[PDB]
Protein backbone atom coordinates (compact mmCIF):
# COMPACT_ATOMS: atom_id res chain seq x y z
CA UNK A 1 0.00 0.00 0.00
CA UNK A 2 0.99 3.72 -0.48
CA UNK A 3 -0.30 7.01 -0.03
CA UNK A 4 -1.33 8.47 -3.45
CA UNK A 5 -2.60 12.17 -2.20
CA UNK A 6 -2.88 13.58 1.45
CA UNK A 7 -4.05 17.06 1.97
CA UNK A 8 -6.01 19.30 4.63
CA UNK A 9 -9.76 18.07 5.18
CA UNK A 10 -11.10 21.85 5.09
CA UNK A 11 -10.04 22.18 1.27
CA UNK A 12 -12.30 19.31 0.33
CA UNK A 13 -15.44 20.38 2.90
CA UNK A 14 -14.51 17.59 5.11
CA UNK A 15 -14.91 18.68 8.80
CA UNK A 16 -11.74 18.07 11.81
CA UNK A 17 -12.54 14.63 12.94
CA UNK A 18 -12.05 15.27 16.62
CA UNK A 19 -10.87 11.88 18.37
CA UNK A 20 -9.95 10.83 21.02
CA UNK A 21 -6.20 12.42 22.10
CA UNK A 22 -5.67 10.88 25.61
CA UNK A 23 -5.75 6.94 26.25
CA UNK A 24 -8.37 5.40 28.12
CA UNK A 25 -5.86 3.05 29.78
CA UNK A 26 -4.73 4.08 33.76
CA UNK A 27 -2.62 1.86 36.00
CA UNK A 28 -4.58 -0.75 37.40
CA UNK A 29 -4.98 -1.40 41.34
CA UNK A 30 -2.67 -4.29 40.10
CA UNK A 31 -0.05 -2.46 38.52
CA UNK A 32 2.78 -2.62 41.49
CA UNK A 33 2.08 -5.99 42.37
CA UNK A 34 2.88 -7.23 39.25
CA UNK A 35 6.08 -6.62 36.72
CA UNK A 36 5.86 -5.23 33.36
CA UNK A 37 7.40 -2.67 30.83
CA UNK A 38 4.53 -2.04 28.57
CA UNK A 39 2.62 1.63 28.09
CA UNK A 40 -0.10 3.29 26.21
CA UNK A 41 0.31 3.87 22.58
CA UNK A 42 1.42 6.90 21.75
CA UNK A 43 -2.33 9.14 20.72
CA UNK A 44 -1.13 12.68 19.39
CA UNK A 45 2.23 14.65 17.95
CA UNK A 46 3.17 16.10 21.46
CA UNK A 47 3.69 13.31 23.52
CA UNK A 48 6.70 13.55 25.58
CA UNK A 49 7.64 9.99 25.26
CA UNK A 50 8.32 10.08 21.37
CA UNK A 51 11.90 9.84 20.55
CA UNK A 52 10.27 9.74 17.01
CA UNK A 53 7.80 12.23 14.35
CA UNK A 54 4.63 10.32 15.10
CA UNK A 55 2.98 11.00 12.12
CA UNK A 56 5.48 9.63 9.86
CA UNK A 57 5.56 6.68 12.11
CA UNK A 58 1.91 5.74 12.05
CA UNK A 59 2.30 6.01 8.20
CA UNK A 60 5.41 4.29 7.92
CA UNK A 61 3.44 1.31 7.68
CA UNK A 62 2.07 2.59 3.75
CA UNK A 63 6.26 0.93 2.28
CA UNK A 64 5.08 1.17 -1.22
CA UNK A 65 3.55 -1.63 -4.01
CA UNK A 66 4.85 -3.93 -5.83
CA UNK A 67 2.92 -3.46 -9.85
CA UNK A 68 2.84 -6.29 -11.42
CA UNK A 69 0.03 -8.62 -13.16
CA UNK A 70 -1.17 -11.73 -11.31
CA UNK A 71 1.48 -14.08 -12.54
CA UNK A 72 1.84 -17.92 -13.45
CA UNK A 73 2.64 -18.58 -9.32
CA UNK A 74 -0.74 -16.50 -8.38
CA UNK A 75 -3.10 -18.17 -10.68
CA UNK A 76 -2.20 -21.95 -9.72
CA UNK A 77 -2.41 -20.47 -6.18
CA UNK A 78 -5.43 -19.17 -6.43
CA UNK A 79 -6.46 -22.39 -8.52
CA UNK A 80 -5.54 -24.42 -5.16
CA UNK A 81 -7.42 -22.95 -2.84
CA UNK A 82 -10.58 -21.92 -4.48
CA UNK A 83 -10.58 -26.00 -5.37
CA UNK A 84 -10.24 -26.28 -0.72
CA UNK A 85 -12.90 -23.79 -0.77
CA UNK A 86 -15.33 -24.95 -3.20
CA UNK A 87 -15.89 -28.22 -0.86
CA UNK A 88 -17.48 -25.92 1.23
CA UNK A 89 -20.52 -24.48 -0.99
CA UNK A 90 -20.47 -20.99 0.41
CA UNK A 91 -23.78 -19.45 -0.83
CA UNK A 92 -22.75 -15.90 -2.98
CA UNK A 93 -26.24 -14.75 -2.26
CA UNK A 94 -26.72 -11.76 -0.12
CA UNK A 95 -27.62 -12.46 3.65
CA UNK A 96 -31.10 -10.69 4.66
CA UNK A 97 -30.42 -7.62 6.22
CA UNK A 98 -31.82 -8.62 10.03
CA UNK A 99 -29.58 -11.30 9.53
CA UNK A 100 -26.59 -9.19 8.46
CA UNK A 101 -27.20 -6.55 11.31
CA UNK A 102 -28.72 -8.21 14.20
CA UNK A 103 -27.62 -11.61 13.80
CA UNK A 104 -27.32 -15.27 12.76
CA UNK A 105 -25.62 -18.23 13.42
CA UNK A 106 -21.96 -17.72 12.27
CA UNK A 107 -22.17 -14.18 12.43
CA UNK A 108 -22.48 -12.29 15.56
CA UNK A 109 -24.97 -9.20 15.69
CA UNK A 110 -22.60 -5.70 13.98
CA UNK A 111 -21.23 -3.94 17.18
CA UNK A 112 -22.93 -0.97 18.48
CA UNK A 113 -19.89 0.08 21.00
CA UNK A 114 -17.75 0.98 17.54
CA UNK A 115 -17.49 3.89 15.51
CA UNK A 116 -20.40 4.50 13.06
CA UNK A 117 -17.97 6.40 10.94
CA UNK A 118 -18.71 8.86 8.23
CA UNK A 119 -20.76 11.51 8.07
CA UNK A 120 -22.54 9.90 11.36
CA UNK A 121 -19.45 10.75 13.51
CA UNK A 122 -19.76 14.55 11.90
CA UNK A 123 -23.29 14.60 13.15
CA UNK A 124 -23.13 13.24 16.76
CA UNK A 125 -25.19 9.97 15.29
CA UNK A 126 -24.02 6.66 17.12
CA UNK A 127 -24.15 3.52 15.97
CA UNK A 128 -27.38 3.06 18.90
CA UNK A 129 -28.93 6.51 17.55
CA UNK A 130 -29.75 3.94 14.04
CA UNK A 131 -29.79 0.41 16.04
CA UNK A 132 -31.34 -1.31 18.66
CA UNK A 133 -30.55 -4.65 19.51
CA UNK A 134 -34.30 -4.92 20.83
CA UNK A 135 -36.29 -4.47 18.35
CA UNK A 136 -34.35 -5.01 15.75
CA UNK A 137 -35.86 -1.89 14.01
CA UNK A 138 -34.48 -1.48 10.14
CA UNK A 139 -36.05 1.54 9.04
CA UNK A 140 -33.53 4.16 10.23
CA UNK A 141 -31.05 2.74 8.86
CA UNK A 142 -32.44 1.84 5.51
CA UNK A 143 -33.31 5.48 5.74
CA UNK A 144 -29.16 6.75 6.51
CA UNK A 145 -27.99 3.85 3.70
CA UNK A 146 -31.05 5.46 1.27
CA UNK A 147 -29.37 9.09 2.31
CA UNK A 148 -26.13 8.91 2.28
CA UNK A 149 -25.30 5.82 0.08
CA UNK A 150 -21.90 4.12 0.36
CA UNK A 151 -18.42 3.89 -0.73
CA UNK A 152 -17.83 6.37 1.98
CA UNK A 153 -14.28 7.69 3.66
CA UNK A 154 -13.23 5.25 5.98
CA UNK A 155 -12.08 7.12 9.58
CA UNK A 156 -8.71 6.55 11.34
CA UNK A 157 -8.43 6.08 14.36
CA UNK A 158 -5.42 5.24 16.37
CA UNK A 159 -5.66 2.44 18.42
CA UNK A 160 -5.83 2.55 22.37
CA UNK A 161 -3.93 -0.30 23.68
CA UNK A 162 -0.61 -1.21 25.60
CA UNK A 163 2.87 -0.99 23.69
CA UNK A 164 6.04 -2.01 24.10
CA UNK A 165 9.16 0.62 25.06
CA UNK A 166 10.41 0.25 21.64
CA UNK A 167 7.18 0.93 19.90
CA UNK A 168 5.89 3.58 22.40
CA UNK A 169 9.13 5.74 21.64
CA UNK A 170 8.94 4.93 17.83
CA UNK A 171 5.27 6.21 17.42
CA UNK A 172 4.74 3.06 16.18
CA UNK A 173 1.07 2.80 17.30
CA UNK A 174 -1.98 1.15 15.09
CA UNK A 175 -4.12 2.55 13.35
CA UNK A 176 -7.63 1.07 12.81
CA UNK A 177 -9.89 2.18 10.05
CA UNK A 178 -13.83 2.42 10.79
CA UNK A 179 -15.96 1.40 7.76
CA UNK A 180 -19.05 3.66 7.50
CA UNK A 181 -22.27 2.02 8.72
CA UNK A 182 -23.27 2.00 5.34
CA UNK A 183 -20.12 0.20 3.82
CA UNK A 184 -20.25 -2.23 6.91
CA UNK A 185 -23.49 -3.49 6.71
CA UNK A 186 -23.30 -3.65 2.85
CA UNK A 187 -20.68 -5.75 2.93
CA UNK A 188 -22.13 -7.75 5.73
CA UNK A 189 -24.84 -8.65 3.17
CA UNK A 190 -22.93 -9.25 0.59
CA UNK A 191 -20.55 -11.56 1.98
CA UNK A 192 -22.38 -12.35 4.87
CA UNK A 193 -22.47 -16.47 3.85
CA UNK A 194 -18.79 -16.39 3.27
CA UNK A 195 -18.29 -14.76 6.85
CA UNK A 196 -20.63 -17.31 8.04
CA UNK A 197 -18.77 -20.35 6.74
CA UNK A 198 -15.37 -19.52 7.64
CA UNK A 199 -16.45 -18.46 11.22
CA UNK A 200 -18.19 -22.75 11.76
CA UNK A 201 -14.95 -24.04 9.58
CA UNK A 202 -11.72 -22.59 11.10
CA UNK A 203 -9.33 -25.39 10.14
CA UNK A 204 -7.16 -26.44 6.77
CA UNK A 205 -9.92 -26.18 4.46
CA UNK A 206 -11.00 -22.65 5.16
CA UNK A 207 -6.87 -21.77 5.77
CA UNK A 208 -8.23 -19.66 8.71
CA UNK A 209 -9.03 -19.70 12.59
CA UNK A 210 -10.68 -16.27 12.60
CA UNK A 211 -13.57 -16.78 14.98
CA UNK A 212 -11.79 -20.09 16.64
CA UNK A 213 -11.81 -20.75 20.31
CA UNK A 214 -7.74 -21.61 21.18
CA UNK A 215 -9.40 -23.60 24.23
CA UNK A 216 -10.92 -26.09 21.53
CA UNK A 217 -8.98 -25.35 18.20
CA UNK A 218 -5.59 -26.08 19.85
CA UNK A 219 -6.15 -29.91 20.17
CA UNK A 220 -7.24 -29.99 16.43
CA UNK A 221 -4.19 -27.68 14.73
CA UNK A 222 -1.91 -30.65 15.04
CA UNK A 223 -4.00 -33.24 13.94
CA UNK A 224 -4.57 -31.35 10.86
CA UNK A 225 -0.85 -29.93 10.32
CA UNK A 226 1.18 -33.44 9.89
CA UNK A 227 4.29 -32.72 8.79
CA UNK A 228 7.18 -30.22 9.24
CA UNK A 229 6.07 -26.75 10.46
CA UNK A 230 6.32 -23.80 8.66
CA UNK A 231 5.79 -19.98 10.22
CA UNK A 232 7.54 -16.96 10.26
CA UNK A 233 6.41 -12.90 10.96
CA UNK A 234 5.27 -10.56 8.64
CA UNK A 235 6.10 -6.78 9.54
CA UNK A 236 3.32 -4.52 8.80
CA UNK A 237 1.37 -7.22 6.74
CA UNK A 238 -1.66 -5.14 5.82
CA UNK A 239 -0.03 -2.12 4.72
CA UNK A 240 2.80 -4.10 2.83
CA UNK A 241 -0.38 -5.20 0.31
CA UNK A 242 -0.14 -4.23 -3.25
CA UNK A 243 -2.89 -4.10 -5.58
CA UNK A 244 -2.16 -7.39 -7.07
CA UNK A 245 -2.95 -9.45 -4.42
CA UNK A 246 -6.44 -7.79 -4.04
CA UNK A 247 -6.76 -9.00 -7.87
CA UNK A 248 -5.87 -12.51 -6.57
CA UNK A 249 -8.50 -12.22 -4.15
CA UNK A 250 -11.40 -11.00 -6.81
CA UNK A 251 -10.53 -13.63 -8.80
CA UNK A 252 -10.93 -16.00 -6.45
CA UNK A 253 -13.92 -14.55 -5.04
CA UNK A 254 -15.28 -14.85 -9.08
CA UNK A 255 -14.26 -18.54 -8.48
CA UNK A 256 -16.59 -19.22 -5.66
CA UNK A 257 -19.71 -17.64 -7.72
CA UNK A 258 -19.53 -13.50 -6.80
CA UNK A 259 -20.43 -11.74 -9.95
CA UNK A 260 -17.98 -8.85 -10.91
CA UNK A 261 -20.13 -6.54 -9.77
CA UNK A 262 -20.31 -8.01 -6.15
CA UNK A 263 -16.16 -8.20 -5.95
CA UNK A 264 -16.78 -4.98 -6.10
CA UNK A 265 -16.16 -4.29 -2.83
CA UNK A 266 -12.46 -5.36 -2.76
CA UNK A 267 -12.00 -2.09 -4.70
CA UNK A 268 -12.75 0.46 -1.72
CA UNK A 269 -10.55 -1.98 0.46
CA UNK A 270 -7.76 -1.33 -2.15
CA UNK A 271 -8.25 2.23 -3.25
CA UNK A 272 -9.59 3.55 -0.02
CA UNK A 273 -10.08 7.27 0.76
CA UNK A 274 -9.49 8.16 4.50
CA UNK A 275 -10.05 10.76 7.45
CA UNK A 276 -7.52 11.50 9.89
CA UNK A 277 -8.38 14.21 12.22
CA UNK A 278 -7.84 17.29 10.07
CA UNK A 279 -6.34 15.50 7.04
CA UNK A 280 -7.86 13.46 4.31
CA UNK A 281 -5.83 10.93 2.06
CA UNK A 282 -6.37 8.16 -0.30
CA UNK A 283 -3.74 4.95 -0.33
CA UNK A 284 -3.22 2.49 -3.31
CA UNK A 285 -3.31 -1.09 -1.76
CA UNK A 286 -3.58 -1.57 1.64
CA UNK A 287 -6.10 -3.43 3.72
CA UNK A 288 -7.95 -0.95 5.98
CA UNK A 289 -7.92 -2.99 9.36
CA UNK A 290 -11.34 -2.36 10.74
CA UNK A 291 -13.75 -2.74 7.84
CA UNK A 292 -15.68 -5.33 7.61
CA UNK A 293 -14.60 -8.88 6.75
CA UNK A 294 -11.07 -7.46 6.87
CA UNK A 295 -9.52 -10.23 9.16
CA UNK A 296 -11.18 -12.93 7.07
CA UNK A 297 -10.06 -11.03 3.34
CA UNK A 298 -6.14 -10.65 4.89
CA UNK A 299 -6.46 -14.40 5.43
CA UNK A 300 -7.61 -15.18 2.34
CA UNK A 301 -5.05 -13.36 1.01
CA UNK A 302 -2.64 -15.03 2.82
CA UNK A 303 -3.71 -18.87 1.99
CA UNK A 304 -2.87 -17.18 -1.92
CA UNK A 305 0.16 -15.63 -0.72
CA UNK A 306 2.10 -18.70 0.93
CA UNK A 307 0.90 -21.07 -1.86
CA UNK A 308 2.76 -18.41 -4.67
CA UNK A 309 6.27 -17.98 -2.98
CA UNK A 310 6.06 -21.91 -2.31
CA UNK A 311 5.27 -22.99 -5.98
CA UNK A 312 8.08 -20.48 -7.15
CA UNK A 313 10.62 -21.33 -5.29
CA UNK A 314 9.82 -25.12 -5.24
CA UNK A 315 8.58 -26.13 -8.47
CA UNK A 316 7.72 -29.18 -7.97
CA UNK A 317 6.06 -28.54 -4.68
CA UNK A 318 2.84 -30.57 -4.20
CA UNK A 319 0.32 -28.19 -2.41
CA UNK A 320 -2.06 -31.08 -1.83
CA UNK A 321 0.11 -32.01 0.54
CA UNK A 322 0.38 -28.09 2.11
CA UNK A 323 -1.68 -27.24 4.99
CA UNK A 324 -1.89 -23.78 6.69
CA UNK A 325 -3.97 -22.12 8.90
CA UNK A 326 -3.96 -18.36 8.92
CA UNK A 327 -5.13 -15.31 11.14
CA UNK A 328 -5.00 -12.10 8.88
CA UNK A 329 -0.79 -12.06 9.19
CA UNK A 330 -0.46 -15.19 11.45
CA UNK A 331 0.28 -18.46 10.16
CA UNK A 332 0.98 -21.82 11.14
CA UNK A 333 1.60 -24.31 8.12
CA UNK A 334 3.15 -27.83 7.46
CA UNK A 335 4.81 -29.65 4.65
CA UNK A 336 5.57 -33.38 4.64
CA UNK A 337 9.69 -31.87 3.54
CA UNK A 338 11.77 -29.34 5.08
CA UNK A 339 10.91 -26.11 3.57
CA UNK A 340 13.62 -23.45 3.51
CA UNK A 341 11.61 -20.40 5.28
CA UNK A 342 14.54 -17.47 4.25
CA UNK A 343 13.84 -18.77 0.56
CA UNK A 344 10.14 -17.88 0.88
CA UNK A 345 10.87 -14.70 2.40
CA UNK A 346 13.25 -13.36 -0.26
CA UNK A 347 10.30 -14.75 -3.00
CA UNK A 348 7.75 -12.67 -0.69
CA UNK A 349 10.12 -9.12 -0.57
CA UNK A 350 9.99 -9.42 -4.67
CA UNK A 351 6.16 -9.29 -4.39
CA UNK A 352 6.60 -6.00 -1.74
CA UNK A 353 6.32 -8.24 1.71
CA UNK A 354 8.45 -8.38 4.43
CA UNK A 355 8.90 -11.73 5.89
CA UNK A 356 11.04 -12.20 9.46
CA UNK A 357 11.99 -15.54 11.00
CA UNK A 358 8.92 -16.38 13.48
CA UNK A 359 8.81 -14.83 16.49
CA UNK A 360 11.69 -12.11 16.52
CA UNK A 361 14.03 -15.52 15.92
CA UNK A 362 17.67 -15.00 15.10
CA UNK A 363 17.34 -16.83 11.74
CA UNK A 364 14.50 -18.85 9.99
CA UNK A 365 14.34 -22.61 9.58
CA UNK A 366 14.21 -23.59 13.70
CA UNK A 367 10.23 -23.85 14.06
CA UNK A 368 8.93 -27.05 16.43
CA UNK A 369 5.63 -27.63 18.54
CA UNK A 370 7.72 -26.58 21.49
CA UNK A 371 8.62 -22.98 20.29
CA UNK A 372 5.80 -22.69 17.64
CA UNK A 373 3.39 -19.81 18.40
CA UNK A 374 0.06 -18.80 16.71
CA UNK A 375 -2.65 -15.61 17.96
CA UNK A 376 0.61 -15.59 20.71
CA UNK A 377 -0.03 -18.61 22.04
CA UNK A 378 2.51 -21.65 22.49
CA UNK A 379 1.29 -24.86 22.24
CA UNK A 380 1.52 -27.54 25.19
CA UNK A 381 0.18 -31.03 25.34
CA UNK A 382 -1.53 -32.27 28.08
CA UNK A 383 0.59 -34.32 30.84
CA UNK A 384 -2.71 -36.47 31.21
CA UNK A 385 -4.51 -36.35 28.30
CA UNK A 386 -2.04 -36.27 25.16
CA UNK A 387 -4.54 -35.68 22.69
CA UNK A 388 -5.77 -32.67 24.47
CA UNK A 389 -3.43 -29.56 23.82
CA UNK A 390 -3.55 -26.54 26.07
CA UNK A 391 -3.19 -23.40 24.46
CA UNK A 392 -0.30 -21.26 25.83
CA UNK A 393 -0.48 -17.32 26.85
CA UNK A 394 2.52 -16.28 28.24
CA UNK A 395 2.09 -14.84 32.00
CA UNK A 396 4.45 -12.13 31.02
CA UNK A 397 1.41 -11.09 29.02
CA UNK A 398 -0.95 -11.66 30.98
CA UNK A 399 1.07 -9.23 33.90
CA UNK A 400 1.30 -6.43 31.39
CA UNK A 401 -2.80 -6.66 30.89
CA UNK A 402 -3.86 -6.87 34.33
CA UNK A 403 -1.60 -3.82 35.50
CA UNK A 404 -3.81 -1.45 33.56
CA UNK A 405 -7.86 -0.67 32.93
CA UNK A 406 -9.19 1.16 30.75
CA UNK A 407 -12.25 1.05 33.46
CA UNK A 408 -12.11 -0.27 36.91
CA UNK A 409 -15.24 -0.76 36.83
CA UNK A 410 -14.59 -4.03 34.66
CA UNK A 411 -12.04 -5.55 37.22
CA UNK A 412 -13.99 -8.47 37.47
CA UNK A 413 -14.56 -9.55 33.89
CA UNK A 414 -10.87 -8.57 33.20
CA UNK A 415 -9.30 -10.63 35.49
CA UNK A 416 -11.47 -13.39 35.34
CA UNK A 417 -10.84 -13.46 31.55
CA UNK A 418 -6.97 -13.08 32.37
CA UNK A 419 -7.39 -16.67 34.74
CA UNK A 420 -9.01 -18.14 31.75
CA UNK A 421 -5.94 -17.95 30.15
CA UNK A 422 -3.47 -18.13 33.17
CA UNK A 423 -4.49 -21.21 34.21
CA UNK A 424 -3.06 -23.09 31.27
CA UNK A 425 0.97 -22.50 32.51
CA UNK A 426 0.14 -24.79 34.82
CA UNK A 427 -1.19 -25.26 38.43
CA UNK A 428 2.30 -23.67 39.94
CA UNK A 429 1.90 -21.06 37.91
CA UNK A 430 -1.74 -20.23 38.52
CA UNK A 431 -1.73 -20.58 42.27
CA UNK A 432 1.07 -17.72 42.39
CA UNK A 433 -1.14 -15.47 40.23
CA UNK A 434 -4.16 -15.81 42.26
CA UNK A 435 -1.98 -14.92 45.44
CA UNK A 436 -0.91 -11.93 44.54
CA UNK A 437 -4.15 -10.67 42.77
CA UNK A 438 -5.28 -11.95 46.60
CA UNK A 439 -2.72 -9.25 47.79
CA UNK A 440 -4.49 -6.54 46.83
CA UNK A 441 -8.16 -6.31 48.79
CA UNK A 442 -9.51 -5.79 45.27
CA UNK A 443 -8.42 -9.08 44.49
CA UNK A 444 -10.47 -10.61 47.74
CA UNK A 445 -13.88 -8.95 46.52
CA UNK A 446 -13.59 -10.93 43.30
CA UNK A 447 -15.02 -14.22 42.33
CA UNK A 448 -12.14 -15.80 40.95
CA UNK A 449 -12.22 -19.82 39.60
CA UNK A 450 -10.37 -22.70 41.13
CA UNK A 451 -7.83 -24.18 39.06
CA UNK A 452 -9.40 -27.88 39.62
CA UNK A 453 -12.43 -25.86 38.09
CA UNK A 454 -10.58 -24.31 35.49
CA UNK A 455 -9.50 -28.17 34.67
CA UNK A 456 -12.72 -29.91 35.08
CA UNK A 457 -14.70 -27.65 32.59
CA UNK A 458 -11.98 -27.76 29.71
CA UNK A 459 -11.65 -31.66 30.36
CA UNK A 460 -15.39 -31.67 30.08
CA UNK A 461 -15.63 -29.02 27.06
CA UNK A 462 -14.51 -31.99 24.48
Known amino acids: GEIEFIESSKDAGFPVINTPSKTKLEPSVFHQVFEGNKEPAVLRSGDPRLKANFEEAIFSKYIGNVNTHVDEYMLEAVDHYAGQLATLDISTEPMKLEDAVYGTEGLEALDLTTSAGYPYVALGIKKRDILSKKTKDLTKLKECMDKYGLNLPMVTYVKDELRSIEKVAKGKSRLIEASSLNDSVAMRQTFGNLYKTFHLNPGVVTGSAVGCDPDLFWSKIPVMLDGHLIAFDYSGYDASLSPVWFACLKMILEKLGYTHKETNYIDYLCNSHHLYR ?183 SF
Not at 296 to 308: G, H
Not at 318 to 342: C, E, K, N, T
Not at 351 to 377: H, Q, S
Open 278 to 460: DKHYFVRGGMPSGCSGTSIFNSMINNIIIRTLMLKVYKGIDLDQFRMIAYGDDVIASYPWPIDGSLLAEAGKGYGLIMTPADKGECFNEVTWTNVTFLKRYFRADEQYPFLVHPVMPMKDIHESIRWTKDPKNTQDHVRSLCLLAWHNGEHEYEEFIRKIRSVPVGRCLTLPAFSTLRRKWLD
